[PDB]
Design a protein around this motif. Sequence first.
Motif, PDB file in Angstrom:
ATOM      1  N   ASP A  64       0.854  -1.187   0.000  1.00 42.54           N
ATOM      2  CA  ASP A  64       0.000   0.000   0.000  1.00 42.54           C
ATOM      3  C   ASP A  64       0.890   1.237   0.000  1.00 42.54           C
ATOM      4  O   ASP A  64       2.063   1.170   0.368  1.00 42.54           O
ATOM      5  N   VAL A  65       0.332   2.352  -0.462  1.00 37.52           N
ATOM      6  CA  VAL A  65       1.013   3.642  -0.457  1.00 37.52           C
ATOM      7  C   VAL A  65      -0.093   4.539   0.087  1.00 37.52           C
ATOM      8  O   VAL A  65      -1.133   4.741  -0.556  1.00 37.52           O
ATOM      9  N   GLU A  66       0.117   5.058   1.287  1.00 35.41           N
ATOM     10  CA  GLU A  66      -0.917   5.868   1.916  1.00 35.41           C
ATOM     11  C   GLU A  66      -0.389   7.048   2.699  1.00 35.41           C
ATOM     12  O   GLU A  66       0.774   7.418   2.589  1.00 35.41           O
ATOM     13  N   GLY A  67      -1.276   7.636   3.492  1.00 35.57           N
ATOM     14  CA  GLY A  67      -0.899   8.769   4.309  1.00 35.57           C
ATOM     15  C   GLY A  67      -0.230   9.891   3.548  1.00 35.57           C
ATOM     16  O   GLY A  67      -0.586  10.218   2.412  1.00 35.57           O
ATOM     17  N   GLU A  68       0.763  10.484   4.196  1.00 31.55           N
ATOM     18  CA  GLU A  68       1.507  11.587   3.623  1.00 31.55           C
ATOM     19  C   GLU A  68       2.251  11.248   2.339  1.00 31.55           C
ATOM     20  O   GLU A  68       2.441  12.116   1.495  1.00 31.55           O
TER      21      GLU A  68
END
Length: 185
Positions: free
Chosen positions: A62-66
């Motif tokens: 996953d690639v998330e947040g900031e």
Amino acid sequence: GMQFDRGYLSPYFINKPETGAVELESPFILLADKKISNIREMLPVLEAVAKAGKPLLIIAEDVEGEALATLVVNTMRGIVKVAAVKAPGFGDRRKAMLQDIATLTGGTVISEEIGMELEKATLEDLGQAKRVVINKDTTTIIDGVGEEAAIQGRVAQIRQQIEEATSDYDREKLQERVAKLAGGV
């Protein structure tokens, strides 16, 4: 080539609206069996890719947040050339498939562990392909640069596993990976 059922993590990575897809020419490909949420750990790879003058496709747990927000904002601004997709599958199967893609693209799977950390990744660790097309539901890697001997070698690995397989479900999954690899060439 090889298509898996995971699409863009943001529609704002799209650059070919006519078909609602992302198209990247001769991109490098980060295969990461971990969740990316801080852009800081991505800098080494980002600087490397900008140096080589090619876009980057991130395939991670996953690639998330900031990290996701910063990549999207900067992609919309034309400051970074990237697209991010979730890796297919879950658990051990996800790792196995990331390795399939790695073999296909001449890359290595980053996954923390020991000597596989993201901040230490180099251009060599990144995979490469002639083109990548990403839409809402799928990702297609076209003409990965992985050596055919390496690809066939992995197909051989997966086929031996099918032999050992003792369940229709597993046999089913392994055969699925073969089709995507052997067809990916």
